[PDB]
Structure formats: C-alpha cells, structure tokens
Amino acid sequence: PFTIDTARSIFPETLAADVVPATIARFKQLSAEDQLALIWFAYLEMGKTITIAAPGAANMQFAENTLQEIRQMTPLQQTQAMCDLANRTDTPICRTYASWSPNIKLGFWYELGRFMDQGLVAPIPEGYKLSANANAILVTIQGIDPGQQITVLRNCVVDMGFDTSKLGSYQRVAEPVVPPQEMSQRTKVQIEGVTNSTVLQYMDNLNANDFDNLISLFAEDGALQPPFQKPIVGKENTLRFFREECQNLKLIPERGVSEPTEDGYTQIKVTGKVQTPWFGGNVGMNIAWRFLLNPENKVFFVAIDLLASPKELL
Amino acid sequence: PFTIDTARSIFPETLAADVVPATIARFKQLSAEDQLALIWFAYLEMGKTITIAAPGAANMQFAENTLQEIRQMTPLQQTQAMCDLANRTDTPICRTYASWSPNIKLGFWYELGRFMDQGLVAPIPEGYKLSANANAILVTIQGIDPGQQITVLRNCVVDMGFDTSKLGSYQRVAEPVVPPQEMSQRTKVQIEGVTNSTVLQYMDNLNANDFDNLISLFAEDGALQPPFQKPIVGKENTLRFFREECQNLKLIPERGVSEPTEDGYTQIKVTGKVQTPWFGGNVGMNIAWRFLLNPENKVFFVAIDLLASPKELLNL
Ligand SMILES: CC1=C(/C=C/C(C)=C/C=C/C(C)=C/C=C/C=C(C)/C=C/C=C(C)/C=C/C2=C(C)C(=O)CCC2(C)C)C(C)(C)C[C@H](O)C1
Ligand SMILES: CC1=C(/C=C/C(C)=C/C=C/C(C)=C/C=C/C=C(C)/C=C/C=C(C)/C=C/C2=C(C)C(=O)CCC2(C)C)C(C)(C)C[C@H](O)C1
Ligand SMILES: OC[C@H]1O[C@@](CO)(O[C@H]2O[C@H](CO)[C@@H](O)[C@H](O)[C@H]2O)[C@@H](O)[C@@H]1O
Ligand SMILES: [Cl-]
Ligand SMILES: [Cl-]
C-alpha cells in the first residue's frame, strides 16, 4: 500500500524550517573568502548568548594531524587551506577532511577558531567587508531561532572539503561507538497522547545510545529521513548513520497523535525538543517525528523535521 | 595577480536575486507529487500575466519520441513517468531527459502542459492539497518579480530527470547552432559610461548569435559565470555553453562603470535588461554583467547576475 516516497508526505501540515536549506543555498552562491568571513561573524555573534561545548580528546585525535600541519604552515598557506576547504578543491587536506564525520569536521573548525583568536592561524582581515548578498544572509541568520542558526552552521561545515563522490581511497573516519548507557541508569520518555511502544523504545534507545536495540524496531524495508536530507533506506545504512552521527543526543518529546491509516498501517506524529551534545541545554531544537508504522508496528518510515517555530509543536 | 575565485568577488555591492536558489532549495525538500503540482499552479497563474512563446519544430523534434511514448501510456504510467522525472529516479525516460539541453527540457514540459489541458495526459487533480511547506513556497513565487519567477521555473525543469553529476561522460542532445545574422544588418548596443570595445563586441556578438567571434574576446584562462551557476572555465567549455544555451537572447544594456584595477587589469560593471526567447518582450530580466578584463583587454572573467530588484540597475 505504502512506499518510502508516499510515506514522506505523512502529516503534510507539519511546517518544516526550510529557511535552513534556503539560507544554505544563498550562502553557497558567495565567494570562498566571503563564506569564511560570514561564518566567523555569525559564530562570534552566536557565542554572545549561546555557549558551545569544547570537544573531547576522543574527537580531537582524528583532526590532530591535519591541525598540526595547518599550525606549522605560513599565513598565506593557512588562508589558502581554509579557502580550499570552502571551495571544495582537490588538495590532500580537503581529501582528509572529506573522509571525516560531521562531529570531526565541527571539532576541527572549533580548534581553528581558537587558533584564529590566539593568533596561531591567520585571522579574518580586520579590513574585511562582506558583499551586499553576504550581509543580507548574515541578517537572516541573526533573525532565525538558535536551533535553525546551529543547523545552518553545521550544514556549512559538513558541505566543505573535497567532494565525497569519486574517492579513490576513503576510510570513513568516525568517532568510536560509546557503549550503550547501563539499563539501570536509563530514563524513560513520556509522550502526551502516545503510548505506542515502538515510538517509546525509539526515543529511549536513542537517548541511551543503544543503536543495536534501536535498529531492531525498524522493518527490513525501513528508512529514516534526517532534517533536510534524503531518506536513508535499509537497516545497514540506518545503523551506520546512528553509530557515526547520532551519539549523545537528548530527545525530549512532549506530545503526539497516533492515527490508523490504510491496510493496518499506523501514522504517528510526535513533537518536542532535541538537544545536541555541541550545546547541551543551551539550545532546544523544535523537532517533529513523523512515523509510519507497518501492521506489525515496525518502523517502515520515520521523518525527523526541524520545525519553523515553537508554534509547530502544537 | 587575479584568479577565477578572486574575480568572483568583483563589484561586491551588486545585490543578486539569491531568493531564486533559496526558493529552489525549499522546493527540493518537497515530495515529487507536491513539486509537480506546485509548478502546475505557479505556471497556471503566471500564464495569465506572462505569455510563453510556443517552441518551434526544430526544438520539438528532439523530445517528439519521448512525448509520443507518454502520449500512448496509461494515466498511472503517465503520472509515474512525471513523478520519476521530479524524483530524479533512474528510468529510460529520465536518462533520455538528462541528455537534453535546457531548451529541449522546457519545450518537452510545455507540450506536456498542453496535453494535460487537452486531457491527453493525466492532469493535476481537482483541488490538490499542497503541503504547508509547498503552499508557502507557492506564495514566495507569486511574490517575486517575473524575471525571478521564470528563473525558478527554468532551474526546477533543468534539475529533473537522471542525475549525471557522478558521470565523467554523458550524451548531449542540443538544438542546431543557427549561423549568425549578416554583419551589416546587426544592431549595436550603447552603454552610458562604457565605451570598452571588448564589452561592446560581447553584447553585439551575443545579440547576433555570433559565438565564434564572441569566444575570440575571451582569454585562454577565461571563464563565464551564469546566474547562480559555478564559473565555466576555458574557451572550449564557454563556446559549447554559448552554442547549446545562449541562442536568441536579447541583451539590452543601459549603463555601466569602467574602473582600473591592480596590475593593468580592468573592472567593468554593466547593468540592463535581458529578454529570453521563451517570453520575448513580456519579461525583462534585471541583469548585471561583472567583467574582469586582463591588461590585453580580453575577458579573463565575466559574471552574469540576476538582480534582486530594478533598484540594482542604478547601483554602480
Ligand atoms: C566553519 C568556520 C568556523 C567554525 C564554525 C564552527 C565551529 C561551527 C560549529 C557549529 C556547530 C557545533 C553546530 C552544531 C549543530 C548541531 C545540530 C544542528 C544537531 C542536530 C541533530 C539533530 C536535530 C538530531 C536529529 C535526529 C533525531 C532526533 C532522531 O530521532 C534520529 C536521528 C537524527 C540525527 C535525525 C570559524 C572558525 C568560526 C570561521 C571560519 O572562517 C569558518
Ligand atoms: C515542469 C512542469 C510544468 C512545466 C512548466 C513549464 C513549461 C515551465 C517553463 C518555464 C520557462 C520557459 C522558463 C524559462 C526561463 C528562461 C530564463 C530564465 C532565461 C534566462 C537567460 C539569461 C538570464 C541569459 C543570460 C546570459 C547572458 C545575458 C550573457 O551575457 C551570457 C550568457 C547567459 C546565458 C549567461 C507543468 C506542465 C506546468 C506542470 C508539471 O507538473 C511540471
Ligand atoms: O531559440 C531558443 C528557444 O526559443 C524558442 C521559444 O519558444 O523558440 C523561439 O525561437 C525559435 C527560433 O530559434 C522560433 O522558431 C520559435 O517560433 C520561437 O518560439 C524555443 O523553441 C527555442 O528552444
Ligand atoms: Cl549532534
Ligand atoms: Cl533562454
């Protein structure tokens, strides 16, 4: 009855924060130097009210060799290396960066920012003026909510380095998988209007980093759609995504609606807050989960949407 | 002194219509059925104000075989075929579509629209309910200028069919290159504040479809950046782009500023109107040309920008 494409259309009144890919698209039109300066100014302004959690040694170890190379470079080489990352050009550093998971890339840029503040790495020239288009993009970023602001920043960091297509040699570099939280120390979510055990186990397993028990809730046909990404189809691909990108998330669902669909299927929409380990309690992202469960109550499809405003929570 | 990347930053106060790639990015997030219905509704209201020029036989011949296949299909097959096009899925029709130039693809969709109106091809339902996000995107499109509206529509059409980005080599079907109009009968542009012959020959050669004389004005290192696209580097690549995508354009430049730069280079900004053969006089796109000429006055880089508003025409 249902396909992955048909399932994408569930709960069509859910207004996603499409200002995020819109702003990214606007950002992509700018020159490399403008792109680098805009992020510098957006990050600096963000830091005045939003505090970032410094990355641990386990994250820093992977980007250590690349950072030490940039640290031993000349100011023109350091600048060119950063321009190459933003331009997506073919360089050994860009190829090394390309192989990293989002968290390694984020941790790498956090360290470079600290180096730029300390004068260890060439800074954004004091006499730098953003283009008319870059200035308007910066105004847009300052006008959107913190959850949308950090998503814009993350997507820009991820989109850098040599194009992953046509690798030649690529060991996907990701952080080690932290053992799942002790069952005795686990918390259980409560969702007003939702008592479906698959949905509840989904939230609880992810909050405990229990990816092996989390993947069991998915059908063989199953798929997961992260915000503004295409659906990730199959248990193997979904599990890899969990292990590489979904460690230490805090899902705080509040309320939801469970509705019967055609041919024994179940449509469940949940809204709540999500905390990223990069900011913790400092940023509460407005999230909606759109579940399409098969007649066996297994996850055939789950869409995770970044919401336009807190109004979308109800 | 200058590189292609450095040249992209010339005249940084030029405010481009980035609402176009922003709206495209928003559009790309929608489902295939929503994407197709949104274009149907955007095109229908646009048709009431902005009249499209029907494609000639020379354009229609390339999409004829594909259109006849869809014409002989069932309503569910016809719908699936159009859904596949929007979804960028791997099917023979999507692979055929991917080989086509923007004009063939546009002409193909124009014919399908006529078939949908005539009931020959499965139409968009009664009062199709667009998603909350699709409705807001449609409002955005209705709120932007005609030049920005048609650019959004064209870019969506171009992005359909099989994705050939992961392919090192792909077949390319394009309209025949019509030989340029005779030199004596040609029109000559006049730009208030710009008398540089390379800039003037650029406008005049393109208005006459004289791509061979147009490419001669470009340096071997030369590049051309179309609106919201990456720069096309080299004479071979730039000439192919002219021959496949730049036939029958009408450039109406109005005014500009010529400024000397570092190491004998010249920075020239021109603003004016551009007419596409798809709409003719019905749509006047607000355009800026950002030229970076080498000390030999050859085009090292030229950026063509779709402007945010007609106010940007006076911004020099
Ligand atoms: C790039 C750059 C610079 C560096 C900037 C930096 C350090 C930026 C860092 C930004 C950060 C840390 C952003 C973090 C964002 C995290 C986000 C948006 C987390 C999102 C996760 C979510 C919504 C989880 C979603 C999920 C749930 C809830 C599920 O149910 C299943 C999985 C899934 C992942 C979809 C500087 C140095 C400043 C200037 C230079 O010129 C350029
Ligand atoms: C796709 C679709 C449908 C079809 C709709 C149709 C037929 C849409 C077609 C729209 C058209 C014809 C759009 C064309 C726009 C043309 C434009 C934007 C041309 C722009 C050209 C410019 C700006 C030229 C610039 C240049 C200049 C000035 C230079 O100096 C150098 C060359 C260069 C090209 C860069 C329907 C059937 C309605 C519904 C279905 O569900 C889906
Ligand atoms: O020429 C580009 C493009 O313009 C279209 C738009 O309909 O055709 C116009 O120009 C043709 C000459 O090139 C005329 O034969 C035609 O009548 C006119 O509409 C497309 O067909 C073509 O791809
Ligand atoms: Cl995260
Ligand atoms: Cl055109």
Side-chain angles (χ1 to χ4, degrees), chain A residues 5 8-9 12-19 21-23 25-26 28-33 83 87 130-133 135-137 165-166 228-230, chain B residues 5-6 8-9 12-19 21-23 25-26 28-33 87 129-133 135-137 166 228-230:
Chain A
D5 187 70
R8 289 191 73 213
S9 301
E13 281 292 272
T14 315
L15 191 74
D18 69 11
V19 67
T23 312
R26 288 171 71 188
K28 285 181 175 182
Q29 309 308 315
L30 307 170
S31 64
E33 64 174 342
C83 266
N87 270 327
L130 286 163
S131 68
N133 281 111
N135 271 317
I137 295 154
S165 176
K166 192 137 259 76
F228 319 112
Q229 281 181 250
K230 290 283 182 179
Chain B
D5 187 69
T6 311
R8 288 191 74 213
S9 301
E13 280 291 283
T14 315
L15 191 73
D18 69 12
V19 67
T23 311
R26 287 172 71 188
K28 285 181 173 185
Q29 309 308 315
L30 308 170
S31 64
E33 63 174 341
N87 255 319
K129 177 195 168 183
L130 285 163
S131 68
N133 281 112
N135 271 317
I137 295 154
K166 289 194 93 172
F228 320 112
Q229 281 181 251
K230 290 284 181 177

Coordinates of all heavy atoms in Angstrom, one line a residue, chain A residues 5 8-9 12-19 21-23 25-26 28-33 83 87 130-133 135-137 165-166 228-230, chain B residues 5-6 8-9 12-19 21-23 25-26 28-33 87 129-133 135-137 166 228-230:
Chain A
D5 N 8.5 6.9 -0.7 CA 8.2 8.2 -1.3 C 6.8 8.7 -0.8 O 6.6 9.9 -0.6 CB 8.2 8.2 -2.8 CG 8.0 9.5 -3.5 OD1 8.9 10.4 -3.4 OD2 7.0 9.7 -4.2
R8 N 6.8 9.9 2.8 CA 7.4 11.3 3.0 C 6.4 12.4 3.2 O 6.6 13.4 3.8 CB 8.3 11.6 1.8 CG 9.6 10.8 1.7 CD 10.5 11.4 0.6 NE 11.1 12.6 1.1 CZ 11.4 13.7 0.3 NH1 11.2 13.6 -1.0 NH2 12.0 14.8 0.9
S9 N 5.2 12.1 2.6 CA 4.0 13.1 2.6 C 3.1 13.0 3.8 O 2.2 13.7 3.9 CB 3.2 12.8 1.3 OG 4.0 13.1 0.2
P12 N 1.1 16.2 6.2 CA 1.6 17.3 5.4 C 1.5 18.8 5.9 O 2.1 19.7 5.3 CB 0.8 17.1 4.1 CG -0.4 16.5 4.5 CD -0.1 15.6 5.7
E13 N 0.7 18.9 7.0 CA 0.5 20.3 7.6 C 1.7 20.6 8.5 O 1.8 21.8 9.0 CB -0.8 20.4 8.4 CG -2.0 20.7 7.4 CD -2.0 22.0 6.7 OE1 -2.5 23.0 7.3 OE2 -1.5 22.1 5.6
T14 N 2.7 19.7 8.7 CA 3.9 19.9 9.5 C 4.8 20.9 8.7 O 5.4 20.5 7.7 CB 4.6 18.6 9.8 OG1 3.7 17.6 10.2 CG2 5.7 18.7 10.8
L15 N 4.9 22.1 9.2 CA 5.7 23.2 8.6 C 7.2 23.1 9.1 O 7.5 23.6 10.2 CB 5.1 24.6 8.8 CG 5.6 25.8 8.0 CD1 5.2 25.7 6.6 CD2 5.1 27.1 8.6
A16 N 8.0 22.5 8.2 CA 9.5 22.4 8.5 C 10.2 23.8 8.3 O 9.7 24.6 7.6 CB 10.0 21.4 7.5
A17 N 11.3 23.9 9.0 CA 12.1 25.1 8.9 C 13.0 25.2 7.6 O 14.2 25.3 7.7 CB 13.0 25.2 10.2
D18 N 12.3 25.2 6.5 CA 13.0 25.3 5.2 C 13.8 26.6 4.9 O 14.5 26.6 3.9 CB 12.1 24.8 4.0 CG 11.0 25.8 3.6 OD1 10.9 26.9 4.1 OD2 10.1 25.4 2.8
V19 N 13.8 27.5 5.9 CA 14.7 28.7 5.8 C 16.2 28.2 6.0 O 17.1 28.9 5.5 CB 14.3 29.8 6.9 CG1 14.5 29.3 8.3 CG2 14.9 31.1 6.6
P21 N 17.7 25.1 4.6 CA 18.3 24.9 3.2 C 18.2 26.2 2.3 O 19.1 26.3 1.5 CB 17.5 23.8 2.7 CG 16.2 23.8 3.4 CD 16.6 24.2 4.8
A22 N 17.2 27.1 2.5 CA 17.2 28.3 1.7 C 18.4 29.2 2.0 O 19.0 29.6 1.0 CB 15.9 29.1 2.1
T23 N 18.7 29.4 3.3 CA 19.9 30.2 3.7 C 21.2 29.6 3.2 O 22.1 30.3 2.8 CB 19.9 30.5 5.2 OG1 18.6 31.0 5.6 CG2 20.9 31.5 5.6
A25 N 21.6 27.6 0.5 CA 21.6 27.9 -0.9 C 22.1 29.3 -1.2 O 22.9 29.5 -2.1 CB 20.2 27.6 -1.5
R26 N 21.7 30.3 -0.4 CA 22.1 31.7 -0.6 C 23.6 31.8 -0.3 O 24.3 32.4 -1.0 CB 21.3 32.6 0.4 CG 19.8 32.8 0.0 CD 19.1 33.5 1.1 NE 19.5 34.9 1.2 CZ 19.1 35.7 2.2 NH1 18.3 35.3 3.2 NH2 19.5 37.0 2.2
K28 N 25.9 29.3 -0.4 CA 26.7 28.6 -1.5 C 27.0 29.5 -2.7 O 28.0 29.2 -3.4 CB 25.9 27.3 -1.9 CG 26.0 26.2 -0.9 CD 25.3 25.0 -1.3 CE 25.5 23.8 -0.4 NZ 24.8 22.6 -1.0
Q29 N 26.2 30.6 -2.9 CA 26.5 31.5 -4.1 C 27.6 32.4 -3.8 O 28.2 33.0 -4.8 CB 25.2 32.3 -4.4 CG 23.9 31.5 -4.6 CD 24.0 30.4 -5.5 OE1 24.5 30.5 -6.6 NE2 23.4 29.2 -5.2
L30 N 28.0 32.7 -2.5 CA 29.1 33.6 -2.2 C 30.5 33.0 -2.5 O 30.6 31.8 -2.6 CB 29.0 33.9 -0.7 CG 27.7 34.4 -0.1 CD1 27.8 34.4 1.4 CD2 27.3 35.8 -0.6
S31 N 31.5 33.9 -2.6 CA 32.9 33.5 -2.8 C 33.4 32.9 -1.5 O 32.9 33.1 -0.4 CB 33.7 34.8 -3.1 OG 33.7 35.7 -2.0
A32 N 34.5 32.1 -1.6 CA 35.1 31.4 -0.5 C 35.5 32.3 0.7 O 35.1 31.9 1.8 CB 36.3 30.6 -1.0
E33 N 36.2 33.4 0.4 CA 36.6 34.4 1.4 C 35.4 35.0 2.2 O 35.5 35.2 3.4 CB 37.5 35.5 0.9 CG 36.9 36.4 -0.2 CD 37.7 37.5 -0.7 OE1 38.7 37.9 0.0 OE2 37.4 38.1 -1.7
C83 N 40.5 28.4 2.4 CA 39.8 28.8 1.1 C 39.5 27.5 0.3 O 38.4 27.4 -0.3 CB 40.6 29.8 0.3 SG 40.1 31.6 0.7
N87 N 36.0 26.0 -0.9 CA 35.9 25.9 -2.4 C 35.6 24.5 -2.9 O 35.3 24.3 -4.0 CB 37.0 26.6 -3.1 CG 36.8 28.0 -3.4 OD1 35.7 28.5 -3.7 ND2 37.9 28.8 -3.5
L130 N 32.0 42.4 4.0 CA 31.2 41.3 3.4 C 30.4 41.9 2.2 O 30.1 43.1 2.2 CB 30.1 40.7 4.4 CG 30.6 39.8 5.5 CD1 29.6 39.7 6.6 CD2 31.0 38.4 4.9
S131 N 30.2 41.1 1.1 CA 29.4 41.6 0.0 C 28.0 41.9 0.4 O 27.6 41.5 1.5 CB 29.4 40.6 -1.1 OG 28.7 39.4 -0.8
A132 N 27.2 42.7 -0.4 CA 25.8 43.1 -0.2 C 25.0 41.8 0.1 O 24.2 41.8 1.0 CB 25.3 43.9 -1.3
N133 N 25.2 40.8 -0.7 CA 24.5 39.5 -0.5 C 24.9 38.8 0.8 O 24.0 38.3 1.5 CB 24.7 38.6 -1.7 CG 23.8 38.9 -2.9 OD1 24.3 39.4 -3.9 ND2 22.5 38.7 -2.8
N135 N 26.0 40.2 3.6 CA 25.4 41.0 4.7 C 24.0 40.7 4.9 O 23.6 40.5 6.1 CB 25.6 42.5 4.4 CG 26.9 43.1 4.8 OD1 27.4 42.8 5.9 ND2 27.5 44.0 4.0
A136 N 23.2 40.5 3.8 CA 21.8 40.1 3.9 C 21.6 38.7 4.5 O 20.6 38.5 5.2 CB 21.1 40.3 2.6
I137 N 22.5 37.8 4.1 CA 22.5 36.4 4.6 C 22.8 36.4 6.1 O 22.1 35.7 6.9 CB 23.4 35.4 3.8 CG1 23.0 35.3 2.3 CG2 23.5 34.1 4.5 CD1 24.0 35.0 1.3
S165 N 32.1 12.1 -3.7 CA 31.9 11.3 -4.9 C 33.3 11.2 -5.6 O 34.0 12.2 -5.7 CB 30.9 12.0 -5.9 OG 30.8 11.4 -7.1
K166 N 33.6 10.0 -6.1 CA 34.9 9.6 -6.7 C 36.0 9.8 -5.6 O 36.7 10.9 -5.6 CB 35.2 10.3 -8.0 CG 36.4 9.7 -8.8 CD 36.1 9.5 -10.3 CE 35.7 8.0 -10.6 NZ 34.4 7.6 -10.2
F228 N 16.2 17.8 6.3 CA 16.7 18.3 5.0 C 17.6 17.4 4.3 O 18.4 17.8 3.4 CB 17.2 19.8 5.1 CG 16.4 20.7 6.0 CD1 16.9 21.1 7.2 CD2 15.0 21.0 5.7 CE1 16.1 21.9 8.1 CE2 14.3 21.8 6.5 CZ 14.8 22.2 7.7
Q229 N 17.5 16.1 4.5 CA 18.3 15.1 3.9 C 17.4 14.1 3.2 O 16.2 14.1 3.5 CB 19.2 14.3 4.9 CG 20.5 15.1 5.3 CD 21.3 14.3 6.3 OE1 21.4 14.7 7.5 NE2 21.9 13.2 5.8
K230 N 17.9 13.3 2.3 CA 17.1 12.3 1.6 C 16.9 11.1 2.5 O 17.8 10.9 3.4 CB 17.7 11.9 0.2 CG 17.6 13.0 -0.8 CD 16.3 13.1 -1.5 CE 16.3 14.2 -2.6 NZ 14.9 14.3 -3.2
Chain B
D5 N 38.6 32.6 -8.8 CA 37.9 32.7 -7.5 C 37.9 34.1 -6.9 O 36.9 34.6 -6.4 CB 38.6 31.7 -6.5 CG 37.9 31.7 -5.1 OD1 36.7 31.1 -5.1 OD2 38.4 32.1 -4.1
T6 N 39.1 34.9 -7.1 CA 39.2 36.2 -6.7 C 38.3 37.2 -7.5 O 37.7 38.1 -6.9 CB 40.7 36.7 -6.8 OG1 41.5 35.7 -6.2 CG2 41.0 38.0 -6.1
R8 N 35.5 36.5 -8.8 CA 34.0 36.2 -8.5 C 33.5 37.3 -7.5 O 32.3 37.6 -7.5 CB 33.9 34.9 -7.8 CG 34.0 33.7 -8.7 CD 33.6 32.4 -8.0 NE 32.1 32.3 -7.9 CZ 31.5 31.8 -6.9 NH1 32.1 31.2 -5.9 NH2 30.1 31.8 -6.9
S9 N 34.5 37.9 -6.7 CA 34.2 38.9 -5.7 C 34.2 40.4 -6.2 O 34.0 41.3 -5.4 CB 35.3 38.8 -4.6 OG 35.2 37.5 -4.0
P12 N 31.4 43.9 -5.2 CA 30.7 43.1 -4.2 C 29.4 43.7 -3.7 O 28.6 43.0 -3.0 CB 31.7 42.9 -3.0 CG 32.6 44.1 -3.2 CD 32.7 44.4 -4.7
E13 N 29.1 45.0 -4.0 CA 27.9 45.7 -3.6 C 26.7 45.3 -4.6 O 25.6 45.7 -4.3 CB 28.1 47.2 -3.5 CG 28.7 47.6 -2.1 CD 27.8 47.4 -0.9 OE1 26.9 48.2 -0.7 OE2 28.1 46.4 -0.2
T14 N 27.0 44.5 -5.6 CA 25.9 44.0 -6.6 C 25.1 43.0 -5.8 O 25.5 41.9 -5.6 CB 26.6 43.4 -7.8 OG1 27.7 44.3 -8.3 CG2 25.6 43.2 -9.0
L15 N 23.8 43.4 -5.5 CA 22.9 42.5 -4.8 C 22.1 41.6 -5.8 O 21.2 42.1 -6.5 CB 22.0 43.4 -3.9 CG 21.1 42.6 -2.9 CD1 21.9 42.1 -1.7 CD2 20.0 43.5 -2.3
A16 N 22.6 40.4 -5.9 CA 22.0 39.3 -6.7 C 20.6 38.9 -6.1 O 20.4 39.0 -4.9 CB 22.9 38.2 -6.9
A17 N 19.8 38.3 -7.0 CA 18.4 37.8 -6.6 C 18.5 36.4 -6.0 O 17.9 35.4 -6.5 CB 17.5 37.8 -7.8
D18 N 19.3 36.2 -4.9 CA 19.5 34.9 -4.2 C 18.3 34.2 -3.7 O 18.4 33.1 -3.2 CB 20.8 34.9 -3.3 CG 20.7 35.7 -2.0 OD1 19.5 36.2 -1.7 OD2 21.7 35.8 -1.3
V19 N 17.1 34.9 -3.8 CA 15.8 34.3 -3.4 C 15.5 33.2 -4.4 O 14.8 32.2 -4.0 CB 14.7 35.4 -3.3 CG1 14.3 36.0 -4.7 CG2 13.4 34.8 -2.7
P21 N 17.9 30.7 -5.9 CA 18.4 29.5 -5.3 C 17.8 29.1 -3.9 O 17.7 27.9 -3.7 CB 19.9 29.7 -5.2 CG 20.1 31.1 -5.3 CD 19.0 31.7 -6.1
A22 N 17.4 30.1 -3.1 CA 16.8 29.9 -1.8 C 15.4 29.2 -2.0 O 15.2 28.1 -1.4 CB 16.5 31.2 -1.1
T23 N 14.6 29.6 -3.0 CA 13.3 29.0 -3.3 C 13.5 27.7 -3.9 O 12.7 26.8 -3.6 CB 12.4 30.0 -4.1 OG1 12.4 31.3 -3.6 CG2 11.0 29.5 -4.3
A25 N 16.0 25.6 -3.3 CA 16.4 24.7 -2.2 C 15.2 24.3 -1.3 O 15.1 23.1 -0.9 CB 17.4 25.5 -1.3
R26 N 14.2 25.2 -1.1 CA 13.0 25.0 -0.4 C 12.1 24.0 -1.2 O 11.6 23.0 -0.6 CB 12.2 26.3 -0.2 CG 12.8 27.2 0.8 CD 12.1 28.6 0.8 NE 10.7 28.5 1.3 CZ 9.8 29.5 1.3 NH1 10.1 30.6 0.7 NH2 8.6 29.3 1.8
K28 N 13.2 21.7 -3.5 CA 13.9 20.4 -3.5 C 13.5 19.5 -2.3 O 13.6 18.3 -2.4 CB 15.4 20.6 -3.6 CG 15.8 21.0 -5.0 CD 17.3 21.1 -5.2 CE 17.7 21.4 -6.6 NZ 19.2 21.4 -6.8
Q29 N 13.1 20.1 -1.1 CA 12.7 19.4 0.1 C 11.3 18.7 0.0 O 11.1 17.7 0.7 CB 12.7 20.3 1.3 CG 14.0 21.2 1.5 CD 15.3 20.4 1.5 OE1 15.4 19.3 2.1 NE2 16.3 20.9 0.8
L30 N 10.5 19.2 -1.0 CA 9.1 18.6 -1.2 C 9.1 17.3 -1.9 O 10.1 16.9 -2.6 CB 8.3 19.6 -2.0 CG 8.2 21.1 -1.6 CD1 7.5 21.9 -2.6 CD2 7.4 21.2 -0.2
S31 N 8.0 16.5 -1.7 CA 7.8 15.2 -2.4 C 7.6 15.5 -3.9 O 7.2 16.6 -4.3 CB 6.6 14.5 -1.8 OG 5.4 15.2 -2.0
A32 N 7.8 14.5 -4.8 CA 7.6 14.6 -6.2 C 6.3 15.1 -6.7 O 6.2 15.9 -7.5 CB 8.0 13.3 -6.9
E33 N 5.2 14.5 -6.1 CA 3.8 14.9 -6.4 C 3.5 16.4 -6.0 O 2.8 17.0 -6.8 CB 2.8 13.9 -5.8 CG 2.7 13.9 -4.2 CD 1.7 13.1 -3.6 OE1 0.6 12.8 -4.3 OE2 1.8 12.7 -2.4
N87 N 11.5 13.1 -9.1 CA 12.3 12.4 -8.1 C 13.7 12.1 -8.5 O 14.5 11.6 -7.7 CB 11.6 11.0 -7.9 CG 10.8 11.0 -6.5 OD1 11.3 11.5 -5.5 ND2 9.7 10.3 -6.6
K129 N -4.3 19.1 -2.6 CA -3.9 19.8 -1.4 C -2.4 19.8 -1.3 O -1.8 18.7 -1.1 CB -4.6 19.2 -0.2 CG -4.2 19.7 1.2 CD -4.6 18.8 2.3 CE -4.0 19.1 3.6 NZ -4.3 18.1 4.6
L130 N -1.7 21.0 -1.6 CA -0.3 21.1 -1.4 C 0.0 21.1 0.1 O -0.8 21.5 0.9 CB 0.2 22.4 -2.0 CG 0.3 22.6 -3.5 CD1 0.3 24.0 -3.9 CD2 1.5 21.8 -4.1
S131 N 1.2 20.6 0.5 CA 1.6 20.5 1.9 C 1.8 22.0 2.4 O 1.8 22.9 1.6 CB 2.9 19.8 2.1 OG 4.0 20.5 1.5
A132 N 1.8 22.2 3.7 CA 2.0 23.5 4.3 C 3.3 24.2 3.8 O 3.2 25.4 3.5 CB 2.1 23.4 5.9
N133 N 4.4 23.4 3.6 CA 5.6 24.0 3.1 C 5.5 24.3 1.6 O 6.0 25.4 1.3 CB 6.8 23.0 3.3 CG 7.3 23.1 4.7 OD1 7.2 22.1 5.5 ND2 8.0 24.2 5.1
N135 N 2.7 25.2 0.0 CA 1.8 26.4 -0.1 C 2.6 27.7 0.2 O 2.4 28.7 -0.5 CB 0.7 26.3 0.9 CG -0.5 25.6 0.4 OD1 -1.0 25.8 -0.7 ND2 -1.2 24.8 1.3
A136 N 3.6 27.7 1.2 CA 4.4 28.8 1.5 C 5.4 29.1 0.4 O 5.7 30.3 0.1 CB 5.1 28.6 2.8
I137 N 5.9 28.1 -0.3 CA 6.8 28.2 -1.4 C 6.1 28.9 -2.6 O 6.6 29.8 -3.3 CB 7.5 26.9 -1.8 CG1 8.5 26.4 -0.7 CG2 8.3 27.0 -3.1 CD1 8.7 24.9 -0.6
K166 N 27.6 12.3 -11.2 CA 28.5 11.2 -10.9 C 29.1 10.5 -12.1 O 29.8 9.5 -12.0 CB 27.8 10.1 -9.9 CG 27.6 10.6 -8.5 CD 27.3 9.5 -7.5 CE 28.5 9.0 -6.8 NZ 28.1 8.1 -5.7
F228 N 23.7 32.1 -10.7 CA 23.6 31.0 -9.7 C 24.2 29.7 -10.1 O 23.9 28.6 -9.6 CB 22.2 30.9 -9.2 CG 21.5 32.2 -8.9 CD1 20.4 32.5 -9.7 CD2 21.9 33.1 -8.0 CE1 19.7 33.8 -9.5 CE2 21.3 34.3 -7.8 CZ 20.2 34.6 -8.5
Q229 N 25.2 29.7 -11.1 CA 25.9 28.6 -11.5 C 27.4 28.8 -11.2 O 27.8 29.9 -10.9 CB 25.7 28.4 -13.0 CG 24.4 27.7 -13.4 CD 24.3 27.5 -14.9 OE1 23.5 28.2 -15.6 NE2 25.1 26.6 -15.5
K230 N 28.2 27.7 -11.2 CA 29.6 27.9 -11.0 C 30.3 28.4 -12.3 O 29.7 28.2 -13.3 CB 30.2 26.5 -10.5 CG 29.8 26.0 -9.1 CD 30.5 26.8 -8.0 CE 30.1 26.3 -6.6 NZ 30.8 27.0 -5.5

